[PDB]
Amino acid sequence: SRWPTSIL
Amino acid sequence: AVVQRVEIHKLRQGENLILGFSIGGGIDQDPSQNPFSEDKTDKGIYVTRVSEGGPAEIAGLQIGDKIMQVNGWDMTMVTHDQARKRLTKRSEEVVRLLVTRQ
């Protein structure tokens, strides 16, 4: 929410 | 923490070369929100998820690993997007990660 993650 | 060196061979998935893991962190993010770091001032790039059977898993990457370098490029003081871009260069099928693991 306040800490995005990204799929790689 | 213990230093590990992993060599990921990306998988072709449509037009893209994918790595099979997710990242959180970066100098532009709130380090206090990182559930994986020992030190909550650590603004580094962390592995937040690993796809079962994917390139990252096969290479030995584990959830919670801190990414120190990708192909010799320093990852300790980059933004989240800069990290994403470094890991996903379409011209690079093989990426070597220097990580630390608790």
* Cα–Cα distance for residue pair B94/A5, rounded to 1 Å: 22
Resolution (A): 1.5
| Cβ separation A6–B29 shorter than 8 A | no
Q: What class is the B1-102 domain? A: mainly beta
Q: Which residue of B has its CA nearest to A1?
A: B33
Q: Which residue of A has its CA nearest to B17?
A: A8
- Closest to B98 in 3D by CA, of B87, B89, B88: B87
The type of residue at B5 is: R
Query: How many helices (H) and strands (E) in chain B?
Result: 2, 8
| Cβ separation B30–A2 shorter than 8 A | yes
Which helix H or strand E contains B80, and what residues bound it?
Answer: helix B80-87
The type of residue at B21 is: F
Name the experiment that determined this structure.
X-ray
- Closest to B47 in 3D by CA, of B60, B66, B29: B66
Q: What angle do CA B89, B33, A8 make, to 5 degrees?
A: 20
The full set of domain ranges for chain B reads 1-102
| Cβ separation B30–A3 shorter than 8 A | yes
